[PDB]
Amino acid sequence: RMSMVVSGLTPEEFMLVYKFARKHHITLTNLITEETTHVVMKTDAFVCERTLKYFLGIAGGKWVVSYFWVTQSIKERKMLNEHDFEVRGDVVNGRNHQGPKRARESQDRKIFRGLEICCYGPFTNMPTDQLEWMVQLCGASVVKELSSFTLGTGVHPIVVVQPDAWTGFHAIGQMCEAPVVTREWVLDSVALYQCQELDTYLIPQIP
Numbered sequence: 315r316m317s318m319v320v321s322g323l324t325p326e327e328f329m330l331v332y333k334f335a336r337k338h339h340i341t342l343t344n345l346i347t348e349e350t351t352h353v354v355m356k357t358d359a360f361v362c363e364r365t366l367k368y369f370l371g372i373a374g375g376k377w378v379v380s381y382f383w384v385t386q387s388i389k390e391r392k393m394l395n396e397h398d399f400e401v402r403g404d405v406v407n408g409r410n411h412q413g414p415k416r417a418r419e420s421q422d423r424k425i426f427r428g429l430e431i432c433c434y435g436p437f438t439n440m441p442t443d444q445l446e447w448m449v450q451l452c453g454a455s456v457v458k459e460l461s462s463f464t465l466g467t468g469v470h471p472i473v474v475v476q477p478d479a480w481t482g483f484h485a486i487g488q489m490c491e492a493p494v495v496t497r498e499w500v501l502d503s504v505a506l507y508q509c510q511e512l513d514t515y516l517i518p519q520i521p
């Protein structure tokens with residue numbers, strides 16, 4: 315069906331989404347879920363902020379759409395095409411880049427294909443369980459302990475760390491045999507819907 319969540323709106327703006335939702339019988343919810351079909355983003359004239367809802371949207375291959383879908387629809391008295399209003403970027407990517415699109419289409423082939431990820435140590439402006447949920451939506455398998463990575467040569471483990479929230483270490487590598495990367499690895503990867511090369515995000519491991 316149609317189920318929307320909203321991000322970056324003022325209350326007045328949200329009321330217009332609410333109005334639109336009434337005229338159309340679309341569901342409007344506070345929290346994103348799997349049922350959520352739509353993520354309505356405040357854009358600048360379709361570049362938005364990178365929010366959790368933005369990530370959980372691309373990650374779920376959803377309709378991540380500019381608030382312009384709504385106003386323009388209201389202004390024309392009917393539901394326009396999501397296609398025409400799809401967001402295209404934020405700060406991992408300026409306008410062009412069609413992250414939500416790569417995403418919305420790919421679903422067979424997901425960016426975290428056959429990976430094992432340990433979100434490790436403390437994180438900030440995003441709860442661990444939401445980063446983990448994101449990571450699964452993208453295809454990864456979640457691992458909770460450094461020591462529980464599967465010993466089957468079949469998979470690729472990865473440790474994810476947000477170096478700030480700590481004071482994890484560059485000593486992770488002493489405790490396992492996985493590349494250790496920063497959270498942006500996942501976040502940039504998710505925005506673009508393109509598994510990014512680890513090189514740029516890899517963190518120093520002390521022998």
Ligand code: NI
Nearest residue numbers: 467468469470
């Ligand atoms: Ni390999």
